[model samples]
Target: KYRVRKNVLHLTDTEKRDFVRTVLILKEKGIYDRYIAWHGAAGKFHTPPGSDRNAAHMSSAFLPWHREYLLRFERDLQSINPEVTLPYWEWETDAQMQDPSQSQIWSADFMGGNGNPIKDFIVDTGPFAAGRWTTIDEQGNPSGGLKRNFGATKEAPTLPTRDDVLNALKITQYDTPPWDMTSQNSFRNQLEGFINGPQLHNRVHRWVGGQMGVFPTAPNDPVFFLHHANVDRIWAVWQIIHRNQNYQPMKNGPFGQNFRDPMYPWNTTPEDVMNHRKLGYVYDIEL
Candidate 1:
């Protein structure tokens, strides 16, 4: 069965219980640990030996790859409850919070508050860190749980302004030559935080700078899905607004043919994700 994703901030207390219980179940079954391993392995590939461009991330595949990645995660969660889907955090909600740590999304009842300086920045709370699933850090150390540091989480402006998101929609093309970080004025690079600037997608990763900041295993942190949900939604919104030009690669020089190129490990490509409706879900809010 398919389900629609909603904003995390708007979720009712009852709606949240299903989410909380679902993740805990995934943790108990060891599925959660495996997600970390896969993402970490991908991260290793991103920085393999010398370059961070070989993997499906941080390159042309960033958007399509993540869209597929989130779908699999969402499907796995649905195995426990078909009606539940990932909830996205708009980030602006946190930006307006009295303190990011005090946001409802970070409450013990929800995702839990930010890291404790005394406890090495590990979340130390929430279902994911509830002592069920075992996980290790990138350095091969026995780390107990995920971590986050919102704001500079302050100065860095982790969330994009309304203008940043608006301007991104104005751009029509999906990607360009080099088809990676250096592309200019391209919708993909703008949102990816390359030339147009680290406006949305890139800024959030940097803003949530601890475990969430790490690309390979960012999924290990529950917030990773929430953040990416919004990012993915933006892509959907962009496509809808620019329906005539919904897909990519005005020209492909290095990264295979645009949109149609098979995203590694998955048969689905960017073309498949351009329309979220086919993917079986849509965002509750418009961009």
Candidate 2:
């Protein structure tokens, strides 16, 4: 594989160090802010002008949209350090830990630990800790620093488990009619975590809390990319299991929801990224 996205836990110490270093470099160079802005902009561009289906999320394109987003972001990271490839936070396995917050991905040298209650739920340990990683608000204004409140909410106090992912993978259809949040028996909806409301992907966001819990500003935290990497990996696996299943809404769907329509904030289409391997990368498990 041209790029093997490894599991976060499997990364060697130097791998962790380099990844964090590159992110800081991107941040310092102001390129990272562009990614944050793109994500927010797509979230606001609802397809067909209304109906809650944004160009990037809450719809069938959620998977491919993020696939392209990560692909582009990975390319930028590669521009900084060619050896660096995105690593996934396998939170499903991390959920098995007695305290998920204690995982190595939260080590002070890496992504940092839980937010400090005394510091208004601000992350203060990792490389991106307060004073280290600057964050932006919904309006793209300076928002002081990155914040996280892991498992602090009643709605999503726990991470989705491996069994949850297994169930979603079993789904046969890529998506169904009315391919919005309400799509039934749809792998897209199930994996997006709206089947039972905030089950997998959405639950992970809420479980992380703070910026990640919010739609428009989630990319403020670097973990958003890793979290989405895992989501993309799940979709990749689904493609393998259902080799015949194709992206839904081939025609007559919302403008951006169609298979060949350009995803907002970029000209890339779902058809451009349906095959992860064709994009020059693969999750480590694919090996």
Candidate 3:
């Protein structure tokens, strides 16, 4: 996930220091190592082993993991600097075809060659550079070339705007078929059916052509967080418009257990994800 300012405030030196410090804190906490292990184990079903492009996509896991990961980081930050809040780059706005360099998520020193601090931004040298996932050939091999460095400078791409997001959503389509229609329906029926259920969500991802599955070893691509944030925002909007469609209770599952079981490496269960309120934070809508 890319750390960036939503406006023209130009992340000050103090903010940059705190941000990097917080990232180090998370690293020290062993979040990256654990996440890598989880994703490596889980990603076997989708990507080939030792594929860096796949690794780049695996990085998509960074967003949600880091969001919660940074909650702790932010808590620590408050002890030192109370006014600072973690910022996010909303990339969905840039979904339209354009040069990624225009997005703010890219740093001015994106691919620093001369030890430029601004160039420290994570560069995605993968098949699907800038949200455009390339298609594999008939033999199931990728045909697209890898993209590296910003269009001009080695700097990170410019951050996207809210208008970019709205524009993308207006054109987005849901056409992919269910991965396992029978199994999906079984799972849905086993549990209380969710409106536009998990099957639909999964299908949407598949239709849109993304790396799916619960594994954590995905790439470290910057688009991950922005993608999910929009999804989260949509869920929030859905809840607001359809108050009756709140989260399902633990007792309503067909698994003969609560809704929180089967935990990820970071936490013990889905129940842990439900308490965004207690986590001591909220995200900006523009993010």
For this target, which candidate reaches the highest lDDT against the unseen true structure? Answer: 2
Against the true structure, candidate 2 reaches a TM-score of 0.99
Which clashing pairs does model 1 show?
46-52, 106-112, 150-153, 151-154, 193-198
lDDT of 1 by residue, 1-287 (tens): 14678988789998898998888888778787766666665545542346545445556667777787788888899998887899988875566555655667877777876766676776677665526435567765566767777665444654666677788888878776566678766787787776645557878887777777777656667788888888888887887787777455633533423567665555677777666778787777752
Root-mean-square deviation per candidate: 3.0, 0.7, 11.3
Which candidate should be chosen as best, given TM-score against the real structure? 2
- lDDT of candidate model 1 versus the reference: 0.71
Residue-level lDDT tens digits of model 2 in 100-177:
988888988889989999999999998899998889999989999889999999989999999999999999999998
The better-scoring model by lDDT among 1 and 2 is 2
Candidate 2 achieves a global lDDT of 0.93
Q: What are the Cα lDDT values of the candidates?
A: 0.71, 0.93, 0.34
Query: TM-score of every model?
Result: 0.87, 0.99, 0.46
Q: Quick one: how many clashes does candidate 3 have?
A: 25
Candidate 3 residue-wise lDDT, 140-249, digit = tens: 34434222332222221233345533332332211111212222322222111122333222322322222222223222322333344444444333334444433332
